[PDB]
Prior knowledge:
It is classed as transcription. Keywords: RNA Polymerase I, Pre-initiation complex, PIC, Open Complex, OC, Core Factor, CF, Rrn3, transcription, DNA opening. By secondary structure, this protein is mostly helical. The chain is built from 3 helices and no strands. The protein has helices spanning 5-15, 27-31, 40-43. The relative contact order is 0.12. It binds one DNA strand through loops.
Amino acid sequence: LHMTSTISILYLASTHLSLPVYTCDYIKWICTAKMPYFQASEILPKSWRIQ
DNA sequence: ACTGCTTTCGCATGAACCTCCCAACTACTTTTCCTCACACTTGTACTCCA
Length: 51
């Protein structure tokens, strides 16, 4: 598993739903730091992070 | 002989350190992750050369 994996299963849930959203509109949504792809560990877990 | 050098003494009672090991500040290894390029071999396409 890799942070690329949480994008891939998000893309399959959007193309089974048959949306006009793509990796053109995923790499623009993560490099602009909109959905928590970069530094997701630093902010989100807060208790599982230490272990 | 009287020499020297001892020595014992003192107003109540009240209060009146040295290595060594831990710290800061750096670097360099540690302890597991996911992500592909490379080297061949069978295969299908090529045009022969008599």
